[PDB]
């Protein structure tokens, strides 16, 4: 459809990309007995290959003129499962990491030896902050609105 790519469950080049690999695996397989560890491993590999090729066609990815999936990172509603759906969860996880790290730094900074608490972590406080870091957007936006997110008296100097 879009970008001149056909869906993968109709691509006549995907069939070859499957059957050639299957036949290679079977050529490897025919060097043992059907009741030996190499044969079991190879049959498992073949079943995994079939299960993989019978999922891309059902998902809705568009293959190319060479029989290979192509990702439409465009915003297309028929393809949200390629970029934006995993991208949102990644952004969630990364904001989580950053927010809990920032909060740990903020809390440690007001102590006796803050430099000591950075080579020797204090696991109770760090764990508390990691736990509380689940609702980080509702906290980051709240700190932005309340004017608590940024400083103004930065210590940069240039003569």
């Amino acid at each position: 459809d879009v970008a001149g790519l056909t869906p993968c469950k109709e691509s006549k080049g995907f069939a070859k990309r499957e059957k050639q690999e299957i036949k290679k695996l079977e050529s490897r397989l025919k060097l043992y007995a059907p009741d030996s560890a190499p044969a079991l491993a190879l049959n498992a590999t073949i079943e995994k290959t079939k299960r993989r090729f019978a999922f891309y066609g059902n998902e809705g990815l568009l293959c190319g003129t060479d029989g290979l999936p192509h990702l439409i990172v465009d915003g297309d509603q028929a393809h949200l499962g390629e970029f934006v759906y995993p991208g949102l969860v990644f952004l969630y996880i990364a904001g989580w990491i950053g927010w809990v790290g920032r909060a740990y730094l903020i809390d440690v900074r007001t102590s006796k030896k803050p430099t000591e608490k950075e080579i020797i972590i204090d696991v109770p406080l760090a764990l508390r902050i990691m736990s509380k870091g689940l609702t980080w957007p509702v906290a980051a936006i709240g700190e932005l609105r309340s004017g608590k997110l940024v400083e103004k008296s930065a210590n940069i100097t240039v003569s």
Partner: protein, 62 residues
């Protein structure tokens, strides 16, 4: 100059601690000293020192 144990912020444009805070140690009250205020900071510079002396008109924010 300023009081002892007072938290002042630097204005020396060529200072490592520019726009940073520090607590005075002891300002010398001699007649002809050009930089009597002595302030110690909680972060060393590229050379490793944390104490430095300024003139009273060169640093004040309270």
């Amino acid at each position: 100059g300023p009081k002892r144990g007072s938290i002042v912020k630097v204005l020396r444009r060529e200072s490592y601690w520019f726009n940073d805070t520090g607590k005075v140690v002891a300002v010398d009250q001699a007649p002809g000293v050009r930089y009597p205020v002595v302030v110690r900071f909680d972060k060393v510079n590229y050379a490793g020192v944390s104490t430095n002396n300024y003139s009273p008109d060169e640093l004040e924010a309270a």
